[PDB]
C-alpha cells in the first residue's frame, strides 16, 4: 500500500463547504442538515492511499461507507459519505477521467423502490447498441441519484439499476464497470 504524494495535496473546511484536493483530485462536501459528499472531479484516478494527515473527520470511518473507495485515493472521512449509498467498489473508475455528482443522467429517471435489483457494478445509461435506458430504480438509496459522467457518457451508482432489467434480455447488452 503506497500513500499518496502530499506535496500538492490540501484540505480545507469553511462555512458550508469542505474540499479535499490534489493535483488531479477535487472532492467537495457540503452541509444540508448533514455533512455529506456532493461533487468530485478526477483528472486521473490513482491507486495510492489518501493520508489522514490531510483528512478531515477521519475518526470512526467505515470503509464500507466511503463513497470513493480507499484503494482509489478515497479520503478516510465522514465527508466521504452519502446517506443511502455504500462504497463504490465497482464504479466506472476505468474511465480515468470522470465527474461524480448527485443529479439525474440525461433523459433518465430514478425512483426509490424495493422492487429493484440489488446493487452491482455501475452501469452506463446506454446499452452496447446505444439504446437509452430510461427508467432506473434503487432499493434504499437517496435522491438525487449518484451519477458519473465520462467520455462515453453517463453512469449510475452501484445501487441504481434498470427498473425493467429483467425484460427484453437487457442484461445481454448492458455496459458495465
Amino acid at each position: 500500500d503506497v500513500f499518496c504524494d502530499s506535496k500538492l495535496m490540501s484540505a480545507a473546511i469553511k462555512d458550508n463547504r469542505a474540499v479535499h484536493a490534489d493535483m488531479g483530485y477535487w472532492i467537495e462536501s457540503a452541509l444540508n442538515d448533514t455533512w455529506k459528499i456532493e461533487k468530485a472531479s478526477f483528472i486521473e484516478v490513482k491507486s495510492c492511499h489518501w493520508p489522514k494527515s490531510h483528512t478531515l473527520w477521519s475518526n470512526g470511518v467505515l470503509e464500507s461507507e466511503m463513497i470513493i473507495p480507499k484503494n482509489f485515493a478515497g479520503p478516510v472521512s465522514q465527508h466521504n459519505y452519502r446517506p443511502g449509498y455504500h462504497t463504490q467498489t465497482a464504479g466506472p473508475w476505468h474511465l480515468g477521467s470522470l465527474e461524480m455528482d448527485f443529479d439525474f443522467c440525461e433523459g433518465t429517471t430514478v425512483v426509490v423502490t424495493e422492487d429493484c435489483g440489488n446493487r452491482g457494478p455501475s452501469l452506463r445509461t446506454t446499452t452496447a447498441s446505444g439504446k437509452l435506458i430510461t427508467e432506473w430504480c434503487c432499493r434504499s438509496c437517496t435522491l438525487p441519484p449518484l451519477r458519473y459522467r465520462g467520455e462515453d457518457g453517463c453512469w449510475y451508482g452501484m445501487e441504481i439499476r434498470p427498473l425493467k432489467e429483467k425484460e427484453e434480455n437487457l442484461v445481454n447488452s448492458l455496459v458495465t464497470a
Partner: antibody
Amino acid sequence: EVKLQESGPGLVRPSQSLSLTCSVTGYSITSGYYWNWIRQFPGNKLEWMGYISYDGRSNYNPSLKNRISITRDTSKNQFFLKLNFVTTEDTATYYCASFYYYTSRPLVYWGQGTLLTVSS
Amino acid sequence: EIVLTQSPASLAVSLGQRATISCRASESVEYSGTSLMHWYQQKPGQPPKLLIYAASNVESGVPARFSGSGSGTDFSLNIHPVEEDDIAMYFCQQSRKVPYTFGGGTKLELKR
C-alpha cells in the same frame, strides 16, 4: 425515451431548395449521439446523407458534398437538413436517425420518415 | 465508399423453415476485433429497425429466432424458425468507414 420526428413539406418544386427538420424528444442533442439524415428511394435503396455530432460538427456523403448542409438548434433540440437544390431524382422518404458514438454505431433510433415529392 | 452486396435480392421461404440472407462488403469492415456491420428489418410504411449490431449481437427486445454471423467481408443473417411476422425487407449496413452505406436489400417472401 428518445424519439425522433421528421417534418417539412411533402412537395417541393424542381431546382428549389429543401429544408427538413428532425425534432428530438427525451434526450439533448448535445451529448451522446450523432444525428444523421438517411433517405430511401422508391426502389427501396437507402442512402446515408450525413450527420452532425453532439458537439455540432457535420460530415457529409461526397455524393452530396456541395449541395448539403446539416445544422442544429440546441435551444429547440432540433437538427436540420438543407439541400441547396433538388431534382425529380430526389423524390424519396427522408428519415432522421441517431447512433451512439461510443458503440459499434448502429442506427438504433429512426423517425417515422417524411415523404418528399419533387415535382412541378 | 464501402459497397455492400446483398444476396439474394428476393428469398422465398416457408413458415417454420430456416432463412439465410448474405451481405458481402467490398473491403474489410473489422476494427479492433469488432465487425462494424449491422442488420435491419423494415416493414411497409415503417422505418428500418435494428435486428443485429456488430454482426452477431441480438438487440434487446429482438426475438431469439434472429441471429448473425460472419467477419471480415462476409456476413449472414439467420432466421429460424421463420414466422409470418418475418415477411419483410432486410438490410445490411456498415459503419467501418464514412460515408456509411447500406446493402441493396433482401425481400423475404412467402413461398408457394
